[PDB]
Amino acid sequence: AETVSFNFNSFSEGNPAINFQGDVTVLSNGNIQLTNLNKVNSVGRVLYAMPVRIWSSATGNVASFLTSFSFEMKDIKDYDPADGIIFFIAPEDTQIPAGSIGGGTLGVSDTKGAGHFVGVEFDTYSNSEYNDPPTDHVGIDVNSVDSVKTVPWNSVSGAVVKVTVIYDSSTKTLSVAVTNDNGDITTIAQVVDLKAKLPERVKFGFSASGSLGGRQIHLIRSWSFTSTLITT
Amino acid sequence: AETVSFNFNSFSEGNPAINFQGDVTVLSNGNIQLTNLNKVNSVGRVLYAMPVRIWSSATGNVASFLTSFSFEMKDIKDYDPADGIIFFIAPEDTQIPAGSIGGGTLGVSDTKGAGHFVGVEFDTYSNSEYNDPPTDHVGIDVNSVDSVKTVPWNSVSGAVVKVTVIYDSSTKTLSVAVTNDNGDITTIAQVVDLKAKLPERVKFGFSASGSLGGRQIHLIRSWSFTSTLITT
Amino acid sequence: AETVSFNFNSFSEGNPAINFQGDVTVLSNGNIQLTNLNKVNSVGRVLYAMPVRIWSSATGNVASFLTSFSFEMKDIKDYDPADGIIFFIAPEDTQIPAGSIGGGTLGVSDTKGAGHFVGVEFDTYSNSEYNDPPTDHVGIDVNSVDSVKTVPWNSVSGAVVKVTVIYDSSTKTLSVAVTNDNGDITTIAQVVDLKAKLPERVKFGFSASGSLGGRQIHLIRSWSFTSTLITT
Amino acid sequence: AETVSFNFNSFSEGNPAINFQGDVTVLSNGNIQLTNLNKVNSVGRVLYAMPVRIWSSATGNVASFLTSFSFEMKDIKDYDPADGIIFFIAPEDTQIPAGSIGGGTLGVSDTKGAGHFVGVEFDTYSNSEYNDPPTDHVGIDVNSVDSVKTVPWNSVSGAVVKVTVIYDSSTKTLSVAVTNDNGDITTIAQVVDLKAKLPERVKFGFSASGSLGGRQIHLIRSWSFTSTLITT
Numbered sequence: 001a002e003t004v005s006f007n008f009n010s011f012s013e014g015n016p017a018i019n020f021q022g023d024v025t026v027l028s029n030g031n032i033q034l035t036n037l038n039k040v041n042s043v044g045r046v047l048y049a050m051p052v053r054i055w056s057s058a059t060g061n062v063a064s065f066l067t068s069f070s071f072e073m074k075d076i077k078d079y080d081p082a083d084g085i086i087f088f089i090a091p092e093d094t095q096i097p098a099g100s101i102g103g104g105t106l107g108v109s110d111t112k113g114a115g116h117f118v119g120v121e122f123d124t125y126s127n128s129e130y131n132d133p134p135t136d137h138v139g140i141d142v143n144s145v146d147s148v149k150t151v152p153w154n155s156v157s158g159a160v161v162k163v164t165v166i167y168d169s170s171t172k173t174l175s176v177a178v179t180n181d182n183g184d185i186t187t188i189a190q191v192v193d194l195k196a197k198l199p200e201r202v203k204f205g206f207s208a209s210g211s212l213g214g215r216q217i218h219l220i221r222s223w224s225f226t227s228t229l230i231t232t
Numbered sequence: 233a234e235t236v237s238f239n240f241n242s243f244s245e246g247n248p249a250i251n252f253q254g255d256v257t258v259l260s261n262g263n264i265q266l267t268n269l270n271k272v273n274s275v276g277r278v279l280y281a282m283p284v285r286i287w288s289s290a291t292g293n294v295a296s297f298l299t300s301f302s303f304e305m306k307d308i309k310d311y312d313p314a315d316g317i318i319f320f321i322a323p324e325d326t327q328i329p330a331g332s333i334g335g336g337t338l339g340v341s342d343t344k345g346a347g348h349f350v351g352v353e354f355d356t357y358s359n360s361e362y363n364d365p366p367t368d369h370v371g372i373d374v375n376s377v378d379s380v381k382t383v384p385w386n387s388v389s390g391a392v393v394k395v396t397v398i399y400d401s402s403t404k405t406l407s408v409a410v411t412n413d414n415g416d417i418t419t420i421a422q423v424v425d426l427k428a429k430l431p432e433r434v435k436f437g438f439s440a441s442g443s444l445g446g447r448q449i450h451l452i453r454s455w456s457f458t459s460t461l462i463t464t
Numbered sequence: 465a466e467t468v469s470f471n472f473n474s475f476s477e478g479n480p481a482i483n484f485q486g487d488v489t490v491l492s493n494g495n496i497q498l499t500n501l502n503k504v505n506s507v508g509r510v511l512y513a514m515p516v517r518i519w520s521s522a523t524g525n526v527a528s529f530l531t532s533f534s535f536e537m538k539d540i541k542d543y544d545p546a547d548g549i550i551f552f553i554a555p556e557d558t559q560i561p562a563g564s565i566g567g568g569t570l571g572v573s574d575t576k577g578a579g580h581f582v583g584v585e586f587d588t589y590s591n592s593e594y595n596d597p598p599t600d601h602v603g604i605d606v607n608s609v610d611s612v613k614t615v616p617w618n619s620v621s622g623a624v625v626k627v628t629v630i631y632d633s634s635t636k637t638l639s640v641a642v643t644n645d646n647g648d649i650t651t652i653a654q655v656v657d658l659k660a661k662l663p664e665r666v667k668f669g670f671s672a673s674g675s676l677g678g679r680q681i682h683l684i685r686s687w688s689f690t691s692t693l694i695t696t
Numbered sequence: 697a698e699t700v701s702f703n704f705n706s707f708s709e710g711n712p713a714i715n716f717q718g719d720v721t722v723l724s725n726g727n728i729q730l731t732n733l734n735k736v737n738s739v740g741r742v743l744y745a746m747p748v749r750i751w752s753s754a755t756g757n758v759a760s761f762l763t764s765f766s767f768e769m770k771d772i773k774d775y776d777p778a779d780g781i782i783f784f785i786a787p788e789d790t791q792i793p794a795g796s797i798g799g800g801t802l803g804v805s806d807t808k809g810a811g812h813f814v815g816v817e818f819d820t821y822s823n824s825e826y827n828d829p830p831t832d833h834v835g836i837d838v839n840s841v842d843s844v845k846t847v848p849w850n851s852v853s854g855a856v857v858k859v860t861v862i863y864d865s866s867t868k869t870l871s872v873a874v875t876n877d878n879g880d881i882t883t884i885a886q887v888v889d890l891k892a893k894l895p896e897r898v899k900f901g902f903s904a905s906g907s908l909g910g911r912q913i914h915l916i917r918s919w920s921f922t923s924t925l926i927t928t
């Protein structure tokens with residue numbers, strides 16, 4: 001069994017174990033701030049440096065994984081609280097899309113909302129061009145910010161949010177459990193064939209974006225992960 | 233939203249939030265020990281005292297839940313390490329089955345292996361009469377110890393095991409993530425309609441058992457839980 | 465440490481975590497309405513269904529607690545706005561006193577105003593038989609509605625009141641902070657030895673009452689609570 | 697009556713409503729970071745710019761108040777997690793003590809551990825020179841970091857902590873409730889005569905400090921406050 005596991009209680013910009021893309025910055029409190037509040041169409045992303053093998057071309061096996069993280073989004077004067085954070089998986093050579101307009105692309109897709117990735121978004125603005133639901137929501141994305149599925153949710157400014165994600169390889173099911181401020185949990189699950197959508201090796205990470213008038217603080221506070229690929 | 237959430241970092245006899253059934257005991261370290269090492273066919277179960285309303289007949293809605301717990305099973309001389317621990321959900325009036333022979337019934341079913349419950353078992357003995365796989369395993373049970381589905385696992389004597397479970401009501405998916413000794417994760421997921429299998433009010437808990445020759449230490453170390461039912 | 469904590473942002477009939485006694489009802493908006501506007505001597509009480517161990521005869525330790533709740537009292541035609549709401553603590557077998565005349569008893573005491581409970585009352589009618597102050601007030605009650613202590617307070621019809629209560633077991637101090645409509649705060653604190661006045665296990669809740677001519681809307685809107693008993 | 701109330705969901709160093717002293721800084725995420733991790737004997741404090749009238753030399757009346765706040769302390773490599781945060785009340789002309797050695801002085805007292813202030817300290821290091829308890833603790837201080845009283849507590853790195861404080865002028869009682877990561881609540885209360893210890897007009901705020909080998913992240917995330925003084 002090939003296992004990749006790690007844990008971040010805090011981040012240090014000088015740690016090579018993580019790739020910093022775009023406007024991402026690391027605060028003195030150890031938090032990763034994904035976007036630059038003072039830039040138009042800002043986009044920042046963070047990736048665990050080591051690529052993870054999610055499936056074997058020899059056995060045909062797909063890995064299962066369990067990951068938990070905590071983020072925080074907070075409103076800022078005088079901008080519309082947008083656009084949200086997305087936890088994504090993508091080719092190891094993934095980079096912020098060329099000429100990215102940020103905003104509703106969440107830093108992972110082109111203007112049409114397409115890209116090569118699988119993710120769980122925590123969307124705080126309704127983009128009609130991507131068929132977003134009317135309210136804040138958590139969504140399961142497969143190569144598009146036009147979610148395969150979404151569930152109503154509520155982004156509380158200044159609130160620390162906990163998320164737990166389980167990917168069961170046999171059923172190809174991706175399950176998400178979000179722990180809100182008011183105490184309630186929000187869940188969403190969807191069958192996504194990682195082996196059919198992503199290459200053998202991939203990088204896991206977070207991305208957030210903003211536009212001209214849409215901006216807010218996007219912070220990653222902690223992140224634990226364990227993936228196990230059966231090789232027997 | 234109707235939410236039920238608790239977090240037991242340890243336990244204590246006298247705590248009104250816990251119903252003890254059978255040979256259950258509380259160790260001075262706070263751990264719960266489910267079976268009596270000196271009793272033939274021992275059965276011990278622990279339940280969260282408060283009944284949980286998992287679905288509403290008035291709205292047809294079903295709750296989602298996130299729960300995680302840690303346990304430990306340890307060998308003893310000279311008995312065969314059996315039988316295992318099961319995290320179950322059952323009618324609020326659930327009691328240890330009458331005339332229970334313990335053993336492979338895990339304290340939740342009758343001799344034939346049938347009962348009224350939904351659970352996640354951590355089986356350490358292969359009972360052919362219940363069609364168990366040949367080795368240790370984690371299984372998803374629905375009214376029977378003859379698992380609807382199982383996955384190879386390994387119970388390490390004295391190893392602390394961590395488990396995270398997510399039930400997404402919308403998809404009716406019950407997914408389990410088990411973090412073992414060597415740090416590898418083992419997962420199993422199964423679509424289970426709690427609404428169709430259980431009554432509106434149920435109780436959550438743990439059960440363990442042994443036989444004349446099959447005995448071992450079964451400990452529950454911690455348990456956190458959050459369930460949310462959309463009331464509207 | 466043995467801890468009981470919960471957070472109700474709203475309520476719903478059927479939640480097994482709440483015990484309804486008397487004329488209480490749940491409104492479509494999630495608010496709990498304690499009294500029946502059409503019944504004489506109406507009494508409604510709501511209790512957290514799980515008993516709380518506030519102290520242990522074995523260790524002698526006493527729990528500390530923090531709780532916040534919000535309520536609203538609203539006038540109606542053509543009845544006299546009475547009688548008020550009381551947040552109370554009583555033995556777990558507590559029931560509305562047999563033959564309750566409601567009114568100034570607040571649903572927790574007998575006609576003489578005596579009972580077995582500890583509570584914080586928000587009194588909107590001056591009962592000379594219980595030595596009430598001449599104006600609305602907040603009072604600390606120990607086995608009697610003839611408050612051990614009171615402080616002037618005004619109940620504004622239709623106003624949302626927010627309350628915060630801290631019980632420090634070491635000093636045995638029960639401290640109350642009441643946040644009015646105008647923004648002013650009103651506080652009252654009293655040393656109350658719960659270990660000497662109540663049994664080890666008790667229930668927390670709210671009660672309200674009315675008489676033939678005294679009636680008003682008594683609503684409980686939210687309630688968060690956390691108690692912790694040291695078991696070491 | 698004379699009331700003062702405010703609420704901070706986030707802070708900005710470019711806001712008049714607040715005084716900054718020492719090495720204090722405001723992070724892009726709105727959080728106030730009291731100490732500088734790169735300085736020896738670092739000391740930082742923040743104060744509500746508007747002095748609050750807590751008692752009257754004309755009437756002898758003393759104000760009551762309710763205030764709550766959330767903070768966060770976090771370890772760093774490779775220093776000792778020290779020294780802590782203290783919520784304090786002091787004369788309006790209060791400033792960081794001249795030649796402050798920071799450290800166990802929490803930035804409010806002299807080397808001997810004396811000063812003019814009343815406060816609630818959240819201590820993460822045991823200074824024997826100030827008779828500190830052997831573990832982390834919450835303390836009530838009256839002109840000295842040699843606490844009038846303390847209670848065992850546990851500072852969890854990276855955890856957001858919520859505090860509620862009530863001062864009841866009639867009983868001169870200062871009660872505190874602190875919400876831990878494991879869910880438990882800790883409380884401590886103490887009779888403190890503010891009229892005798894402090895001037896009519898005072899300033900409320902926060903202070904934190906570090907030493908050569910003792911440093912950690914000290915954050916003040918939010919702060920609500922309401923005080924009411926009767927003028928009649």
Ligand SMILES: CO[C@H]1O[C@H](CO)[C@H](O)[C@H](O[C@@H]2O[C@H](CO)[C@H](O)[C@H](O)[C@H]2O)[C@H]1NC(C)=O
Pocket residue numbers: 080082083101102103104105125127210211212213214215
């Ligand atoms: C004319 O539209 C551009 O400028 C406005 C502000 O004047 C917005 O920034 C708009 O972007 C959209 O903004 C929201 C929030 O207000 C959110 O960030 C959306 O994702 C984003 O598309 C911007 N247009 C574009 C296409 O960038």
Ligand SMILES: CO[C@H]1O[C@H](CO)[C@H](O)[C@H](O[C@@H]2O[C@H](CO)[C@H](O)[C@H](O)[C@H]2O)[C@H]1NC(C)=O
Pocket residue numbers: 312314315333334335336337357359442443444445446447
């Ligand atoms: C003749 O079989 C009974 O007695 C033997 C020991 O002499 C076992 O205790 C056996 O029970 C089975 O024991 C294993 C462990 O080796 C495990 O506990 C199985 O679940 C259990 O059935 C017992 N027979 C029965 C059916 O109770």
Ligand SMILES: CO[C@H]1O[C@H](CO)[C@H](O)[C@H](O[C@@H]2O[C@H](CO)[C@H](O)[C@H](O)[C@H]2O)[C@H]1NC(C)=O
Pocket residue numbers: 544546547565566567568569589591674675676677678679
């Ligand atoms: C003769 O007194 C009885 O009937 C009157 C109305 O006709 C009142 O209901 C009175 O009760 C007292 O009413 C006030 C409100 O005006 C408040 O509810 C008091 O607590 C209550 O005693 C009632 N007498 C009694 C003792 O029930």
Ligand SMILES: CO[C@H]1O[C@H](CO)[C@H](O)[C@H](O[C@@H]2O[C@H](CO)[C@H](O)[C@H](O)[C@H]2O)[C@H]1NC(C)=O
Pocket residue numbers: 776778779797799800801821823906907908909910911
């Ligand atoms: C010789 O002692 C001085 O230098 C050491 C370096 O290891 C410490 O910084 C020490 O200060 C004390 O440090 C702890 C943490 O390790 C905590 O911050 C105490 O409050 C502080 O006294 C320092 N001495 C002094 C008096 O500054």
Ligand SMILES: [Ca+2]
Pocket residue numbers: 083104123124125126127132
């Ligand atoms: Ca969007």
Ligand SMILES: [Ca+2]
Pocket residue numbers: 315336355356357358359362364
């Ligand atoms: Ca078995």
Ligand SMILES: [Ca+2]
Pocket residue numbers: 547568587588589590591596
């Ligand atoms: Ca009265």
Ligand SMILES: [Ca+2]
Pocket residue numbers: 779800819820821822823828
């Ligand atoms: Ca100290």
Ligand SMILES: [Mn+2]
Pocket residue numbers: 121123132133139145147
């Ligand atoms: Mn979306």
Ligand SMILES: [Mn+2]
Pocket residue numbers: 353355364365369371377379
């Ligand atoms: Mn089995």
Ligand SMILES: [Mn+2]
Pocket residue numbers: 585587596597603609611
């Ligand atoms: Mn009264």
Ligand SMILES: [Mn+2]
Pocket residue numbers: 817819828829835841843
């Ligand atoms: Mn101290």
